[PDB]
Design a binder for these strands. Sequence first.
RNA 1: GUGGGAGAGGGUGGUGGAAUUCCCGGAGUAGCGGUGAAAUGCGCAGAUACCGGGAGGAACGCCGAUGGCGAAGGCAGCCACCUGGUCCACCCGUGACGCUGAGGCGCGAAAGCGUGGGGAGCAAACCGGAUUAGAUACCCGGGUAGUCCACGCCCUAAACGAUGCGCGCUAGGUCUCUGGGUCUCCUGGGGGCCGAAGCUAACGCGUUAAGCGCGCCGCCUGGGGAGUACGGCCGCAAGGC
Lengths: 70, 87, 116, 101
Amino acid sequence: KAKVKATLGEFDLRDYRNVEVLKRFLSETGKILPRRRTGLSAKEQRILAKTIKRARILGLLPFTEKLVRK
Amino acid sequence: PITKEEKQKVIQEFARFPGDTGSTEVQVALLTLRINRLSEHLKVHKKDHHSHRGLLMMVGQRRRLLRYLQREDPERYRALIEKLGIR
Amino acid sequence: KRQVASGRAYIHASYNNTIVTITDPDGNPITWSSGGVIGYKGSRKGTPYAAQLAALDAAKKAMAYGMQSVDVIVRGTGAGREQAIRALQASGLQVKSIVDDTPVPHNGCRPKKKFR
Amino acid sequence: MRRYEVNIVLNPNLDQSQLALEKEIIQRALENYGARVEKVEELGLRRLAYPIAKDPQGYFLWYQVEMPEDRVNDLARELRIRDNVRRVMVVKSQEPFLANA
RNA sequence: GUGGGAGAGGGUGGUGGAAUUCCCGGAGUAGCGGUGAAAUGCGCAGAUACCGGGAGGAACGCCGAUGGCGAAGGCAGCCACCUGGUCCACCCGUGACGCUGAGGCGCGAAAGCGUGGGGAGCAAACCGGAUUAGAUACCCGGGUAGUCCACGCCCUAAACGAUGCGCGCUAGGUCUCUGGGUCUCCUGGGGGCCGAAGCUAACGCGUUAAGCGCGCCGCCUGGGGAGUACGGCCGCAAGGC
Ligand SMILES: [Mg+2]
Ligand SMILES: [Mg+2]
Ligand SMILES: [Mg+2]
Ligand SMILES: [Mg+2]
Ligand SMILES: [Mg+2]
Ligand SMILES: [Mg+2]
Ligand SMILES: [Mg+2]
Ligand SMILES: [Mg+2]
Ligand SMILES: [Mg+2]
Ligand SMILES: [Mg+2]
Ligand SMILES: [Mg+2]
Ligand SMILES: [Mg+2]
Ligand SMILES: [Mg+2]
Ligand SMILES: [Mg+2]
Ligand SMILES: [Mg+2]
Ligand SMILES: [Mg+2]
Ligand SMILES: [Mg+2]
Ligand SMILES: [Mg+2]
Ligand SMILES: [Mg+2]
Ligand SMILES: [Mg+2]
Ligand SMILES: [Mg+2]
Ligand SMILES: [Mg+2]
Ligand SMILES: [Mg+2]
Ligand SMILES: [Mg+2]
Ligand SMILES: [Mg+2]
Ligand SMILES: [Mg+2]
Ligand SMILES: [Mg+2]
Ligand SMILES: [Mg+2]
Ligand SMILES: [Mg+2]
Ligand SMILES: [Mg+2]
Ligand SMILES: [Mg+2]
Ligand SMILES: [Mg+2]
Ligand SMILES: [Mg+2]
Ligand SMILES: [Mg+2]
Ligand SMILES: [Mg+2]
Ligand SMILES: [Mg+2]
Ligand SMILES: [Mg+2]
Ligand SMILES: [Mg+2]
Ligand SMILES: [Mg+2]
Ligand SMILES: [Mg+2]
Ligand SMILES: [Mg+2]
Ligand SMILES: [Mg+2]
Ligand SMILES: [Mg+2]
Ligand SMILES: [Mg+2]
Ligand SMILES: [Mg+2]
Ligand SMILES: [Mg+2]
């Protein structure tokens, strides 16, 4: 149960059109992950948020998903 | 907006000697330029209020600066007023 | 005699009733059941037991159409929500997957004073 | 002038000629709004996250530009006007804030 | 002044998805809904549950905090444009240009008024179902104003930190948001918590004073009568000072 920034290279927290990096920041549902699981700074998180929502508008990232098992 | 460039144009215009950035002349200029932009704004966008408070405050500063530079050097004051189309 | 043998089972649970709907792979329903169908009436109608009976009715009714392999979608919450799934899993329909689809607003509509 | 990233997302079903067309008209827009072209990126076929316009998919192309900022809003109106342009976004270019650096 | 920043501060346009409701369509029976339990109610003119499409209004889940911004009211989808405040560094410019501020003028949550729109959900009034010694109130089912937008009024409040603004001074510890640094730390500006000296009737406050001081404004003088009467001013009114 490590953090997200933990496994990753350098990446652009500003880049919406890049999904492969972003999917890593989302839950099994469409939910942007709490800071706890992402391990960002307030600044870092605040930027990530906006960037996600931007790509969601562009249809590259889901607003919501369905929950398996259970 | 106001570019650094379209701004420093006005400082070069009002500077009393080279490099005069903060003289009373040049503060009243700069202020006035911002007051005008802000009013051209608040003519449309009439419902914007917090901006308009900004205007109130800016104009307040311009005045205190004038009222000074006038009690101090009436001649530089007359000149200033004339240049700026005011009072 | 629609001949389906594989398809969707929605389970709609509420704090009042519980309904189950069986359907074909693109969603057109086949049969269904509920707390009400199964004899129950009152409050009595939303208890886990009644959920059981309801799921089981709709499973037998599916059997009649030929149903075997079923992919489950729960929506809603309430006592004997999961009872219904544990009573599908006792049916003899073999359950592929269980997903949770409870809709949620992204905060659109005022609710009733009961909710605030 | 300022530097903007324009995105356009299209109906995938275009063949050569229709797509050629949309891009001739988009070039026409930019050229007619005072908007100069800095660079271009077409990632093309891409799988969407949710269906856009009943479609599983979209045709992406990205554009870095410089242009007059009183116009930009009207630019975007003109872009989205076409049927076949399913989505359009425009952002101001912001420099690349890093992370995990 | 130059350079660097954080931000639901504001105004205008556009735009996105979830959900509710309603319309159309397919499939499909006998119920659904709702409560402590019921009943009104809806459903064979085919409901509920499920799938596809459509229309419309309103509000933005996760991120979101013990967080940020604003003078206060207040302010959360994304994008663009217009715009306000504010922090830091450099020590560059002016040279006391400062503080407070009766009056004036502007802003001012919600409800409320006027004219015109819009109306999905909620919903004062109201029509009902039920509980009860009796609802007529709590619980359930409908529902109109209203809520939403434009313009113009209204000026209220637990408009609260129940703490007027500004400056200097007076241990520290700790958590935090945002800058700059030679970056375990230090230095500046916010937000919190313990606590030195001190203050306090106590409760408590304590570098975000309720401490030690100076300036200026507002306000108090037992409890009711009473925010009443009378008068004045404002207001279409309600009503306000
Ligand atoms: Mg029931
Ligand atoms: Mg089974
Ligand atoms: Mg109702
Ligand atoms: Mg600056
Ligand atoms: Mg804002
Ligand atoms: Mg139908
Ligand atoms: Mg009946
Ligand atoms: Mg009837
Ligand atoms: Mg629909
Ligand atoms: Mg309608
Ligand atoms: Mg939250
Ligand atoms: Mg806060
Ligand atoms: Mg700014
Ligand atoms: Mg000096
Ligand atoms: Mg000197
Ligand atoms: Mg003052
Ligand atoms: Mg007075
Ligand atoms: Mg006053
Ligand atoms: Mg109101
Ligand atoms: Mg009335
Ligand atoms: Mg009205
Ligand atoms: Mg009694
Ligand atoms: Mg009611
Ligand atoms: Mg008001
Ligand atoms: Mg309070
Ligand atoms: Mg408050
Ligand atoms: Mg005092
Ligand atoms: Mg720091
Ligand atoms: Mg640092
Ligand atoms: Mg501090
Ligand atoms: Mg502290
Ligand atoms: Mg304390
Ligand atoms: Mg002591
Ligand atoms: Mg004392
Ligand atoms: Mg004591
Ligand atoms: Mg004591
Ligand atoms: Mg004590
Ligand atoms: Mg003090
Ligand atoms: Mg005291
Ligand atoms: Mg008395
Ligand atoms: Mg008295
Ligand atoms: Mg009164
Ligand atoms: Mg009298
Ligand atoms: Mg009177
Ligand atoms: Mg009168
Ligand atoms: Mg009254």
